[PDB]
Amino acid sequence: AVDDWSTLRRIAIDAVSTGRNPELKWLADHPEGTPAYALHLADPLEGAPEGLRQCLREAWDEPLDSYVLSHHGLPELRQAMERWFADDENWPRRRRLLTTATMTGTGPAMYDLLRTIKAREPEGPMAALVPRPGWDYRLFAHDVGYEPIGYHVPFTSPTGPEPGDLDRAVEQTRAKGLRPTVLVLNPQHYATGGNWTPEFVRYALSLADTLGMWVLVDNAYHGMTAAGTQPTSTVRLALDGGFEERLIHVRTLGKQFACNGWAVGSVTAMPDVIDEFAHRWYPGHAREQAAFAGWLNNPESRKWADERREAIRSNGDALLDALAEVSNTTRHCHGGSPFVLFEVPGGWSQEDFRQRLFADTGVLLASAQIPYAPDWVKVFLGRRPDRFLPAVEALRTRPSRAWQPR
Amino acid sequence: PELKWLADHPEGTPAYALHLADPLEGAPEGLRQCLREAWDEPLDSYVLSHHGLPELRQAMERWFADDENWPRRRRLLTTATMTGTGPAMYDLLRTIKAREPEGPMAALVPRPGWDYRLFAHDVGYEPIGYHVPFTSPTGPEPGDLDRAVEQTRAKGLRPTVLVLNPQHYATGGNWTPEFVRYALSLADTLGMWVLVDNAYHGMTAAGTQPTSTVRLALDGGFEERLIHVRTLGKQFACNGWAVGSVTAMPDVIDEFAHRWRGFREYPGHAREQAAFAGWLNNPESRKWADERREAIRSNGDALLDALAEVSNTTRHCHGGSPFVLFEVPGGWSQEDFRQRLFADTGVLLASAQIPYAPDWVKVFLGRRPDRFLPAVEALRTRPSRAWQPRLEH
């Protein structure tokens, strides 16, 4: 019965404009004293696991407020992070890649990695091959001086692009007179729920090697596939295939541990690359770095992550059942990243639909943002069940004409 | 180089690292208490407002407007910064570029000064330095700005941005109202944006009145292209927290927040921001800041006294930003001097980095007296030949 309104008010309401996104106006107009549930972002508002917050609390009296004098972050965090991800992703022990810590988000990290690659490569016309739909890679690419070229990602298939989808992007890059310079992969895919095939990832890695392209793999959701799913590990496939020199792995700790605002993540690449990245393109936030190191070295973190994969599975099942009671549109729950997709009832468009649904039920859902299929909705599943299931209940019990085709 | 010396330092003797603008202290206890007490609140998520956490944006706007004596009525809007005022100035420079016609642009920056030239070059401005005299406690004169404008004109560049830093990193200067007024009126005539960095505004030695650029600007009507930037880090002994503020006209902040910052960074660090709002909204934060200006004054006096005891060179303590400057004895480069001094005394100092005066040292004063004064005593009681001239006429 516990909702999100008090927290949404604290983080989204202000006396000046809070942003251009429509949902911020809906929140500003939301009736005070009535429930509101936020399922539109991969961002659990109930907060981080207690074990992590306890690490932060217990160090309040330690001198952790200054600059951090290693540009790569605290060694204790670098080590605990590389350990946790290498185990999670079954990295081989025989590797030359080194791991550096990032403290202001992996968005900024991939922006500066695109600049790092650009600095290492001969000046010329540069394409970044990015998944479409996908996360925000195209925005960083454009601002750094690459033309972003989308490769098709089907949302109706649990298994992601086929090799021919990549080939078509390479062909369009050549037709535009550009060199294919970096390929972004995101096999636990934001935000279709896909878990791309080892077949396609191996194809992508071999094609990149043939073309001399860099491969940037974003593994934000690798550890958050629904229980019973086997996530494809790009680093394992790449190193076993002998593609290492131009591999860059990026992964936020925030999506993994319900703490997006902590902004701690990791970048793993060849030594010369992480050296240029960290020095050319002092850090801070030692309190977050010290707290994460203690948490990741605690076996409770692995237990909590395992339990969360089971919650993602059961949460999706519960949402699917509710959607079946209130609606008759197509639904997907592919299990590869923690999102459910469903089609907007006929005669509605997705924005009007979500606005009306939020007014009638208090449940705020997100546009799926699929460019070739705009009128689909996406629902994030990576929340504690005691905070996700009340939102499902509101959908199942509060009537709305949003569900009825026009 | 300095970090290397620190590593070869013998274990068993005190080392005092005074070469950074960082006290290597815990942040004020009240601030850390605010962080600790909120450990069980749900503050781990992204912030959904593109200005940062509302309670912090509001508290820091109020605290700075009081500290800097801003007029109560103004159209400027204040946003929070969550990744450093360096990235913020990078994004502000890009916001300005997007609003001006294309063509070659100069950014006028203080020389010596902070690293504004690095951001300006990166975004595609040519950085043009204006002379900042370090011997005067009041900094540049109007003709120093006029010279940079004429250099800009001779290179066929449009002067597009002027960066002002009146509590100056890192000379100690406190620039005069007359100079800042001249700079604002000249920028307005030329259509230049004024970016004022006020990192050290609240950090002047007690008894020194910092010049408030925003007050002078708004009194004179120079609002439309004014941008204020100010970190909380240097003042409140918490460089690692990367919380600060930017204030500009509403349309400028919106583009900065939505497009230039907003297409790269997602707002976060709600824990730091809530802790700062609790601190700034506590009367103890103002009391602590006042007590800190007294500590900066007494620290600088104590260093000057110790220098008079062990040395016979020119020294400055201008009182406008928390730095003491002094000249190395004859026959010493600044690097050899600081390396010898650190070896003999355990006290590590910084180069002043004055390009027209290389062999000078600077000393940051913003640290607790019970931690600064032991370093001063080390300089007095540990003999060093660094203080003796190595030249003879």
Author numbering:
A (entry chain D): 6 to 286, 292 to 416
B (entry chain A): 27 to 419
Sentences copied from the publication:
The biosynthesis of the lincosamide antibiotics lincomycin A and celesticetin involves the pyridoxal-5′-phosphate (PLP)-dependent enzymes LmbF and CcbF, which are responsible for bifurcation of the biosynthetic pathways. To understand the molecular basis for the differences between LmbF and CcbF, we solved the X-ray crystal structures of LmbF and CcbF with PLP at resolutions of 1.7 Å and 1.8 Å, respectively.
Although the residues lining the active-site cavity are in comparable positions, Asn205, Phe236, Leu83′ and Pro302′ in LmbF are uniquely substituted with Tyr195, Tyr226, Tyr72′ and Tyr292′ in CcbF, respectively. In CcbF, His76 interacts with the amide of the substrate, and Trp140 and Asp141 form a hydrogen-bond network with the carboxylate of the cysteine moiety, maintaining an ~90° dihedral ψ angle between the Cα–COO− bond and the pyridine ring of PLP. The PPL moiety of 4 is flexible and located at the entrance of the active site, which is consistent with the substrate tolerance of CcbF. These differences in the binding modes of the cysteine moiety would allow CcbF to catalyse decarboxylation as the first step in the enzyme reaction. As a result, the LmbF-like conformation is thought to be a non-reactive binding mode in CcbF. These in silico analyses suggest that the active-site Trp140 and the Tyr72′, Tyr195, Tyr226 and Tyr292′ residues in CcbF play important roles in substrate binding and selectivity in the first step of the enzyme reaction. Afterwards, due to the absence of a proton donor residue, the quinonoid intermediate donates an electron to an oxygen molecule to generate the semiquinone radical and superoxide. Furthermore, the CcbF Y72L/Y195G/Y226F and Y72L/Y195G/Y292A variants, containing the mutation of Tyr72′ (Leu83′ in LmbF), catalyse oxygen-independent β-elimination.
